[PDB]
């Protein structure tokens, strides 16, 4: 809705001021309501102006000229807002044409460790703020966990590949700046069982509904029943799902017991009636004989002999009336027994097939979180849900590497340079690095500040790949330990011809056991060339890294032949298998919220380190060691956009420290 | 994280 849509696209509320804005504009937020609305409009309009054309720099001069009365009345207010938005990277980020070239004299010196999206985004900002920036990258390429396979005409992503909707996504801006061939992914995903036959529509919808019900139940367990600690240990999502499933199996058995208990009570009610009837039939038999004996005493009789005939007649008919009132009650209980035998409860909660299809949905969840469900925090695994972008998910058909390559332009990047040691004191910083091709060749880099974008997997390493001098404080290292770093792998299969449904982007393979549920469970058809991409998720990812490419591709072909036919599936021209946990420069795929951890650990990851004074009694020194990366952004973890935003945050923080605020 | 589910997006517990 114009200016309101600009705030939404920048992840800001249109009608109120944020915590960051309150810090930079305390006079406004504590002041009258009218001035706040003036601030909010200037903010929203400036954002709209940038968002309308993100290919060119938006200056203060261009901003003020396009503002109307009475908003362009206060010129220093407009300047304060513009500077704030520029400094925090909400406007003028990414690849844009600079209207007046950057000042020749550079102020301050920053070393950035790592040339992924977080590193590159921070580097661009710091350079455009007028700082001396050098990036040190261990790999022979930029991009990091954005890694695109390219051989001949085949293009496929081994790392990041999906833009998770454009509504509120900073990657929407980047896509208007860099030629990303964004193609919408169609949601339709048919599942094929181990035999190779598709799951019927009725069963498929039943299992999926039960899956979401099971997930909703674990949330109920967490929030309402407070089932978060068990045996002095934090409860995992996997644990909670087991508990819910077990209680559903219990209810199936409890309702079976209650049903067959209604049968025995009816049978025993019938048993008491049948005994009563057998005893009365014998009394009726005896009294009939007594009647006919008295009746065979032929007339004329005295009145006592007549009474004997008449009284035995009354007594017999009364017992026959009593028998008839039990005979239809027998019928009432036999039909009650008929309907109970015809209407039993459920035999099982889930069959063997139902459990297997459910294990696919669990594997799909294990893909998303890049980790087995027994490692995820029950309370906090989905803490970033409210920050989900709107719109369809999109493939980067051009190959995602086009983004970091474009961000790399005009930057001083030292490739094949592995950081070994980070030194930080009150005077400044030393970064000690080696050449990866020749490890004896040593490099020393001196700087005012260090920005660490090393993956969480690298920071977790014992023994360490990178040493910090002095050692990182306990609050930092404990957060590094608590936090989860997951794993996920991809198998790229390049063919000469399309043998699959071209209008179907996604199809699933249902595994035989729970143990192998994530093993080649999902297939992607996304690219212009005939390429199929298979995922290895959950417990399978770590195990499948110890298996050779030929065997993995063999298992891929066996699954596809089951679905499409042996004659229909040719041998692939090119194959690639990712091994992200084994990769020394990643040591996994992306962060997750582990059991025992929370969203607060992401904030602790983001917090800069301040060294002690050199001389004792010297004033409190400034922060020297800064952190960015997907593992440092609470609201957008484990993504490209989150990495991007973490870089923009840190550049703004470093510039505030070393160039002064505003 | 959960927002990355392109295929069969989970709904339970949001």
């Amino acid at each position: 809705s114009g200016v309101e849509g600009a705030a939404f696209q920048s992840r800001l509320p249109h009608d109120r001021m944020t915590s960051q804005e309150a810090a930079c504009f305390p006079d406004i937020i504590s002041g009258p309501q009218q001035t706040q609305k003036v601030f909010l409009f200037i903010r929203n309009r400036t954002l709209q102006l940038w968002l309308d054309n993100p290919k060119i720099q938006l200056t203060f001069e261009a901003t003020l000229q396009q503002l109307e009365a009475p908003y362009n009345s206060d010129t220093v207010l407009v300047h304060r807002v513009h500077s704030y938005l520029e400094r925090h990277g909400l406007i003028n980020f990414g690849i844009y044409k600079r209207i007046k070239p950057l000042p020749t004299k550079k102020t301050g010196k920053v070393i950035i460790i790592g040339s992924g999206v977080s590193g590159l985004a921070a580097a661009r900002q710091l350079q455009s703020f007028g700082m001396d920036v050098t990036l040190l990258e261990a790999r022979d390429r930029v991009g990091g966990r954005v890694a695109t396979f390219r051989k001949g005409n085949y293009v496929a992503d081994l790392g990041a590949m999906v833009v998770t909707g454009l509504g509120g996504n900073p990657m929407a801006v980047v896509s208007k700046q860099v030629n990303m061939e964004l193609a919408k992914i169609k949601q339709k995903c048919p599942l094929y069982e181990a035999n190779g036959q598709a799951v019927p529509k009725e069963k498929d919808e039943m299992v999926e509904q039960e899956f979401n019900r099971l997930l909703e139940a674990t949330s109920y367990l967490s929030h309402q029943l407070d089932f978060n600690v068990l045996n002095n240990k934090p409860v995992s999502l996997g644990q909670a799902l087991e508990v819910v499933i077990q209680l559903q199996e219990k209810h199936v058995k409890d309702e079976q017991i209650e049903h067959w208990k209604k049968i025995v009570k009816t049978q025993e009610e019938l048993k008491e009636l049948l005994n009563k009837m057998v005893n009365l039939k014998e009394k009726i038999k005896e009294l009939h004989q007594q009647y006919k004996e008295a009746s065979e005493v032929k007339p004329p009789r005295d009145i006592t002999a007549e009474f004997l005939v008449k009284s035995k007649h009354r007594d017999l008919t009364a017992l026959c009336k009593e028998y008839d009132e039990l005979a239809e009650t027998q019928g009432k209980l036999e039909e009650k027994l008929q309907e109970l035998e015809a209407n039993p409860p459920s035999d099982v909660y889930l069959s063997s097939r139902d459990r297997q299809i459910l294990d696919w949905h669990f594997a799909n969840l294990e893909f998303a979180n890049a980790t087995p469900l027994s490692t995820l925090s029950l309370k906090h695994w989905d803490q970033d849900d409210d920050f989900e972008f709107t719109g369809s998910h999109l493939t980067v058909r051009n190959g995602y590497s086009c983004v970091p390559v474009a961000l790399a332009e005009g930057l001083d990047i030292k490739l094949n340079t592995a950081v070994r040691q980070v030194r930080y004191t009150a005077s400044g910083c030393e970064v000690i690095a080696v050449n990866t091709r020749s490890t004896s060749q040593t490099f020393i880099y001196k700087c005012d500040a260090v920005l660490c974008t090393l993956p969480l997997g690298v920071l977790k390493q014992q023994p360490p790949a990178v040493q910090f001098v002095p050692p990182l404080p306990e609050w930092k290292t404990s957060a590094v330990q608590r936090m989860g770093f997951g794993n996920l792998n991809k198998v790229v299969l390049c063919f000469d011809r399309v043998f699959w449904d071209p209008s179907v982007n996604l199809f699933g393979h249902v595994g035989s056991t729970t143990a192998s549920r994530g093993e080649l469970f999902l297939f992607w058809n996304l690219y212009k060339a005939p390429i199929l991409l298979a995922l290895v998720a959950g417990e399978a990812a770590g195990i499948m890294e110890n298996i050779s490419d030929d065997v993995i591709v063999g298992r891929c072909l066996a699954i596809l032949k089951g679905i499409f036919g042996s004659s229909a599936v040719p041998q692939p021209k090119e194959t690639v298998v990712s091994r992200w946990r084994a990769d020394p420069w990643a040591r996994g795929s992306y962060s997750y919220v582990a059991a025992g951890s929370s969203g607060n650990d992401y904030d602790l990851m983001a917090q800069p380190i301040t060294p002690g004074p050199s001389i004792p009694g010297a004033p409190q020194p400034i922060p020297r060691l800064f952190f960015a990366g997907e593992h440092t952004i609470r609201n957008y973890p484990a993504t490209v956009h989150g990495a991007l935003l973490s870089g923009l945050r840190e550049a703004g923080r470093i510039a505030d420290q070393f160039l002064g605020a505003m | 994280s959960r927002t990355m589910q392109t295929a069969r997006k989970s709904t339970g517990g949001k």
Partner: protein
């Protein structure tokens, strides 16, 4: 409130997560009791089958034809003598006495108790009935 059709109570959660094998113990305990109840079902089914076999033919050879006749105001000597014996056997059950005589209503029987109280010593007759 839990999702409709799912069952999760504070008591049931604690029983399943009490120890490492508490879940399998609870589920097997209910499995054994299901076999135990079904065995009892088969037992009573076989008992009832034997009892139903003894009731074959019902009470058909022992049922008597229903004879109905119009009520008469006049008491014959025979009807009076039938009544005195009926009082001796049945007491104050006026319905039973009516069915014995055959042609006297429940109200007419009740009047007989008052009309012939002195002449048929009905007080003495009812005392003989209570004594047994």
């Amino acid at each position: 409130k839990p999702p409709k059709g799912m069952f999760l109570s504070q008591e049931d959660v604690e029983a399943v997560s009490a120890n490492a094998t508490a879940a399998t113990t609870v589920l097997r305990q209910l499995d054994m009791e299901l076999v135990s109840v079904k065995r009892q079902i088969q037992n009573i089914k076989q008992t009832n089958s034997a009892l139903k076999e003894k009731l074959d033919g019902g009470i058909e050879p022992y049922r008597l034809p229903e004879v109905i006749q119009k009520c008469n105001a006049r008491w014959t000597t025979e009807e009076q003598l039938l009544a005195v014996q009926a009082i001796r056997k049945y007491g104050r059950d006026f319905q039973a006495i009516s069915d014995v005589i055959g042609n006297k209503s429940v109200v007419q029987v009740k009047n007989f108790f008052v009309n012939y109280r002195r002449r048929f010593n009905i007080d003495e007759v009812l005392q003989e009935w209570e004594a047994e």
